């Protein structure tokens, strides 16, 4: 009856013996049936892990859990599929087979393809409502959580509509998104529109832009931080401030800014180098000491968001994004890349634990694109930055990224993994388009 979530799919025995590496202890037909329900979804939790494609998941599993290991979160969803994420050429309207975060995020949040860079607008720079605005217009509580800057593409796509993702605050909008600039009659910069969106719960990094002052409007002259305060937001800066929060709703919306830029990474390690796998010692990742008890983790912010949003009888929509990574200091950083996937796995566990006992929640876990980083043989012969790592298996694993150091890792256009659990989770199985995700969520919650 109850919908289950794979309890354990680690190599079941001796990987050296026949059937030793099996992850299945028996037939799964019954399990899949039990996983299928067309019942209405009261809530939705969408976990997005930056660049977390199959290669990323495999690498993190090999390192942190062993090749035969198992993520009780990420590998735990029963229904699985592959989706396409291509963007559109702005001039021609033809596909542009390598999307950027902005266009990808616009696709699942609005359901329309658009051009790389665009946020909440199509190729005609025309606005389109987001799954989040729609949820609000139905009385559902809303949550926007990310370990990156709240102004970055993923969380912004839910609450902002600009012609360029660059338009973080006033200054930047004035020059790159003139038609969006407040002082030009526009709806304003990404941060200004975020304050208008007014989600019940918004947690993450990106407090820097909030230091900027508005150039026009009702709050002209004061910092965007001061504006949030004047508009009744509960401004929180650390773990202690966040925990003391007892409620979050439209009268007292929660806005948590936990870092100037992105939030601290989980793991630290040297970066990959030319011939690193043989010319540099094998790496063992170290914990980021900057991970204070005073700075909430992706998992803790998910927990708090769920607590606050669950108090709404009608239901809620929450988006959690695990991408504390940057560009290029974290960069071509396997250690930082791996610890990031572990961060997401923890958040996904909390989401699944909540969704399982509530029984009316659809949890969707996916990535926005795959990174060209790859797991190669210790004796690789290919050109590029490499690093050997000591995995949990007591064996070494080599990694290589096909990008130019002094250059950030590139995107690819490969269709990628999406998994779901709960009511309407079936709609992610098989091949689908990134825009189908908008429609799947819309239908599961029954939004008009």
């Amino acid at each position: 009856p109850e919908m289950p979530v794979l309890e354990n799919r680690a190599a079941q025995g001796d990987i050296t013996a026949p059937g030793g590496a099996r992850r299945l202890t028996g037939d799964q037909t019954a399990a899949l049936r039990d996983s299928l329900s067309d019942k209405p979804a009261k809530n939705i939790i969408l976990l997005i892990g930056d660049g977390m494609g199959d290669s990323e998941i495999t690498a993190a599993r090999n390192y942190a859990e062993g090749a035969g290991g198992f993520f009780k979160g990420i590998d735990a969803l029963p229904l699985t599929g592959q989706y396409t994420h291509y963007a559109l050429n702005k001039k021609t309207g033809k596909p542009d087979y390598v999307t950027d975060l902005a266009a990808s995020a616009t696709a699942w949040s609005t359901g329309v393809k658009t051009y790389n860079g665009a946020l909440g607008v199509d190729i005609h720079e025309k606005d389109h409502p987001t799954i989040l605005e729609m949820a609000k217009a139905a009385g559902l509580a809303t949550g926007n959580v990310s370990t990156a800057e709240l102004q970055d593409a993923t969380p912004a796509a839910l609450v902002a509509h600009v012609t360029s993702r660059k338009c973080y605050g006033p200054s930047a909008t004035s020059e790159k998104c003139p038609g969006n600039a407040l002082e030009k009659g526009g709806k304003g910069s990404i941060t200004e529109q975020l304050l208008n969106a007014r989600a019940d719960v918004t947690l993450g990094g990106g407090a820097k832009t909030f230091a900027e002052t508005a150039t026009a409007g009702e709050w002209q002259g004061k910092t965007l931080r001061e504006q949030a305060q004047a508009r009744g937001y509960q401004l929180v800066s650390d773990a202690a401030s966040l925990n003391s929060v007892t409620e979050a709703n439209q009268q007292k919306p929660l806005l948590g800014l936990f870092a100037d830029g992105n939030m601290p990474v989980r793991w630290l390690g040297p970066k990959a180098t030319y011939h690193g796998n043989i010319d540099k010692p094998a790496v063992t990742c170290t914990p980021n000491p900057q991970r204070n008890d005073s700075v909430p983790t992706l998992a803790q912010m998910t927990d708090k968001a769920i607590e606050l949003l669950s108090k709404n009888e009608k239901g809620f929509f929450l988006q959690v994004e695990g991408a504390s990574i940057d560009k290029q200091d974290h960069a071509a950083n396997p250690c930082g890349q791996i610890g990031e996937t572990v961060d997401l796995d923890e958040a996904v566990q909390r989401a699944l634990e909540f969704a399982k006992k509530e029984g009316n929640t659809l949890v969707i876990v996916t990535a926005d694109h795959a990174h060209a980083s790859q797991i190669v043989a210790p004796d690789t012969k290919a050109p590029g930055l490499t690093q050997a790592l000591n995995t949990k298996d007591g064996a070494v694993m080599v990694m290589s990224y096909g990008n130019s150091e002094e250059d950030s890792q590139e995107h690819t256009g490969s269709q990628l993994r999406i998994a779901a659990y709960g009511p309407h989770a079936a709609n992610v199985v098989g091949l689908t388009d990134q825009t189908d995700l908008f429609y799947t969520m819309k239908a599961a919650l029954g939004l008009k």
Binding site: D100, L101, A102, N116, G117, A118, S164, R165, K166, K176, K327, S408, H411
Partner: peptide, 10 residues
């Protein structure tokens, strides 16, 4: 248009 851009600059 950042990922990462060119320009987005001076």
């Amino acid at each position: 248009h950042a990922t990462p851009p060119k320009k987005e600059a001076d």
